[PDB]
Amino acid sequence: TLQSLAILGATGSIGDSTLAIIRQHPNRYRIHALTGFSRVDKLLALAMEFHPVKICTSPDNYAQLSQKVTDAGLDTIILSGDEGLIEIASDEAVDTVVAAIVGAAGLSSTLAAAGAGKRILLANKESLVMAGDLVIKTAKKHGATILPIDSEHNAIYQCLPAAIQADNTAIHHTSYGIKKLWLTASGGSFLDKSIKQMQNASVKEAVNQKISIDSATMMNKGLELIEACHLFDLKEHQIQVVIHPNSVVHSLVEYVDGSFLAQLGTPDMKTPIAHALAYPERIKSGVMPLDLYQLGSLKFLAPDLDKFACLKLARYAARLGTGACIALNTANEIAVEAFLAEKICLTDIAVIVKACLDDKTIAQDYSQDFGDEVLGLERILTMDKKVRKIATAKIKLLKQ
Amino acid sequence: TLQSLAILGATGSIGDSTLAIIRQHPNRYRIHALTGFSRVDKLLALAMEFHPVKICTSPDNYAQLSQKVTDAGLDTIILSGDEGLIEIASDEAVDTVVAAIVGAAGLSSTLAAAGAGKRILLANKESLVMAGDLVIKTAKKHGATILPIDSEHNAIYQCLPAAIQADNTAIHHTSYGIKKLWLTASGGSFLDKSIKQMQNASVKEAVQKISIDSATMMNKGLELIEACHLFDLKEHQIQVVIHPNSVVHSLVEYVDGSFLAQLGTPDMKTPIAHALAYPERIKSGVMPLDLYQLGSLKFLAPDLDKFACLKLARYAARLGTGACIALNTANEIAVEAFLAEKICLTDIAVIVKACLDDKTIAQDYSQDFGDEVLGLERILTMDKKVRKIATAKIKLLKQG
Q: What is the separation, in whole angstroms, between the first and last Cα of chain A?
């Protein structure tokens, strides 16, 4: 029963929560490897505590990290760059990979873990936005098990029957009676602000960091919707969004008899991570539990899609397939960076995304099979590079 | 495939919802029998529509019903009384029994269905308050499957893992990680009223046995006892949360911090369809919950100084079945007395507590009310004894 873990992106929030669970349950989990691109001193401290066989950092931090490791008298193998992540994720001594590297940087190690038949605790939604068919097919072919540890998707997973948890395609058997998935969304910091205040928002006002902007625009939720389409083997029409500012209800599953099953909790990521680590069993997580007696009013409302145009664009991209999802994701990234550099305003993010989605040169690639086992990854990366250039040019076209 | 149903207590709310489902799904469900003690014309109208092989009514209404059945041209077998209910519940041609007779009047037919290995859709919580160990043991011995169709308990059942749904005792394996059950309660009509207004409430202001129990929160204390049996727990593992909206129908707290909940509308077709089709799901014909149109959902701690009956239910649960019978029987006699304007609303708890604490009643608490051969007679003996003592306590109170 003891699982050997590799944590890909071990120095942030997911890593903290995962390691805290491991501290509490040494008979079930041990650390084989940890990675961290930027936080050399924290990575070193984790290595001194957990004694991983291997760690990996960025090529630029390799010399520094290796210095510090040898100063501390540690026997650990270092590793750097994309191929170090792949090595760690595919290592025969690893049972379970916690995939918490943000963005496109995480895609090739996630594929390697899938290709090696690992249990994958998935916290890197961009890998499914960019490569969802390829990732899911590869995992299925090699017997890798994907468990979502994002809050919303973990909640949905908990609220589906065991046969559908084990085989996502079973959702299409009518006898299970899944009618719709419901993603909850906090609404972000402009939920109670006008479109005009979005238009005029300063960077300071928008963050309250890529992640905060995506939450401000609701692109975060649109990317989650795409992710859900893959994880749960559904089309976008079968996944609806409800605004829930309290973030107590983490998402819901609607059944054909009228039952809505939901998972509720606090924001502490130990909850979904413990659920996924122990699955199909459950374990103590150490969280301060939700206090039902001390909840404010829980509120729910329809999302305003005229204001949150990114969510609408995500849903269009989902219908068009992986090529359009890559374009959406890549254009959004380049537009967010431009917003942060004060080159465009917040409401112009959707404008750049739409212009890329509709661009005939991009759209000509939508019919490619980005799920192709041999050609898929190169097609995905080629599409990303092409869209990055075009999105940059649209920003200039707009601001000229 | 096709299930043959007997509906015990077919003329009320549960029967209306169940029969509505059967109208929608003739290939899965057919009516073998229907019962109704008091609503002869309605029972006749259902018999004319569904063509049951048997029906049953009270001894007093047998001649009238028999006349009307003859006059309408029907071929049906007419039974009467307790032994007619037992005959219908234990009939070899019946697959599934919907047990919706209110109060003690439902106990012996519920036992007979259990003893005959039927699937039992249980809406008669008093059978488990009075006889829970006996009912559960008998069902286990004979392969009867109990599915709760009361809203709260059905919600809990939906939120438990499949192994615990199939075997209630599996809850005690720590690997499933059940931490607590949470029953939701509307709080009743005096939730926002003072103790003085309860004391002074007229019968008109208070509302029928069921409405009084909701006013006092005894309803919820009886559900708590019911849950102890259905889910094989002690009362301290089952908590109550006030939830006036009644959107959340109950919850299950797991050791990792996850609270799984079932949400829906009040339409009983939802839990009934869930239990009829289990382990599959079916369309119930309900108007589904509209998440976009919810008022805000409120939760709060129950006020146990005001709702003394809930507190007395919990004390009864710790003392065992004998005390639960005493509680249930004293409550019934006290409710009758309130309705006859002999005592005030806040005196219901006073009578119930005096019975629970009575040395003569309490000497019977150590009896095995679960004994297969002696249990039913012990239960009925205890009921009769408490009924006499409670009547005497009411008289002793109208003085001192």
A: 61
